[PDB]
């Protein structure tokens, strides 16, 4: 029913859960996926709660190939929780080294043009039916062309990890974000 010792302190260690909430988030997760391993078909079933469905379920599988590092095919209560931990507590620097992490489809250290238009084509697909884009940016082509063309500064048509994270920086929602550095 609850977290050994041992397990307990490598996800303090690991996240950014209290301890507290690592034994109520490991109570709820055994509660919800009692087999204690989420598969592809329930990640796409939570999601789905946010988005329809169809429209969620290709982003929602490249999240799970991220999310799943072992790449086995399920995500343990370990996988869960540190994936979780990172994208809604992180760091920043961090964020954008998973999101990365998940754009490289292959995992040879480069996002090439087309691994960026499919996860972009996925994200547009997901939010379809409910947000209604800014206008330049505003189809998987279009906008898959403005980032290569603001964030390739060498020109290789393919991105390393420190010019995705640079250029991330200058999006709108990071812009926004920055104003708000407790460095005053
Ligand atoms: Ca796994
Ligand atoms: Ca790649
Ligand atoms: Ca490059």
């Not at 020109?155 to 812009?175: H, M």
């Given at each position: 029913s609850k977290l050994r010792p041992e397990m307990l302190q490598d996800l303090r260690e690991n996240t950014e859960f209290s301890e507290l909430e690592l034994q109520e988030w490991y109570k709820g997760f055994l509660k919800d996926c009692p087999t204690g391993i989420l598969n592809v078909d329930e990640f796409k079933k939570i999601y789905a709660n946010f988005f329809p469905y169809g429209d969620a379920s290709k982003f929602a599988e490249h999240v799970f190939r991220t999310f799943d590092?072992?790449?086995?095919?399920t995500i343990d209560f370990r996988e869960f929780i540190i994936a979780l931990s990172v994208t809604s507590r992180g760091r920043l620097e961090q964020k954008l080294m998973w999101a990365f992490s998940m754009y490289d489809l292959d995992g040879n250290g480069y996002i090439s043009r087309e691994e960026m238009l499919e996860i972009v084509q996925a994200i547009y697909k997901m939010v379809s039916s409910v947000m209604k884009m800014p206008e330049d940016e505003s189809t998987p082509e279009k906008r898959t062309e403005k980032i290569f063309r603001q964030?390739?500064?060498?020109?290789?048509?393919k991105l390393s990890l420190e010019e995705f994270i640079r250029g991330a920086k200058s999006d709108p929602s990071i812009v926004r974000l920055l104003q708000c550095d407790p460095s005053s």
């Amino acid at each position: 029913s609850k977290l050994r010792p041992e397990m307990l302190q490598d996800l303090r260690e690991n996240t950014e859960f209290s301890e507290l909430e690592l034994q109520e988030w490991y109570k709820g997760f055994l509660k919800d996926c009692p087999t204690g391993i989420l598969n592809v078909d329930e990640f796409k079933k939570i999601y789905a709660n946010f988005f329809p469905y169809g429209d969620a379920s290709k982003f929602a599988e490249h999240v799970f190939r991220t999310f799943d590092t072992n790449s086995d095919g399920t995500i343990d209560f370990r996988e869960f929780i540190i994936a979780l931990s990172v994208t809604s507590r992180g760091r920043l620097e961090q964020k954008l080294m998973w999101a990365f992490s998940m754009y490289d489809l292959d995992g040879n250290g480069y996002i090439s043009r087309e691994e960026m238009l499919e996860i972009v084509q996925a994200i547009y697909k997901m939010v379809s039916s409910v947000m209604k884009m800014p206008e330049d940016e505003s189809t998987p082509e279009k906008r898959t062309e403005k980032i290569f063309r603001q964030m390739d500064t060498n020109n290789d048509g393919k991105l390393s990890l420190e010019e995705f994270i640079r250029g991330a920086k200058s999006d709108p929602s990071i812009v926004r974000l920055l104003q708000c550095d407790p460095s005053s």
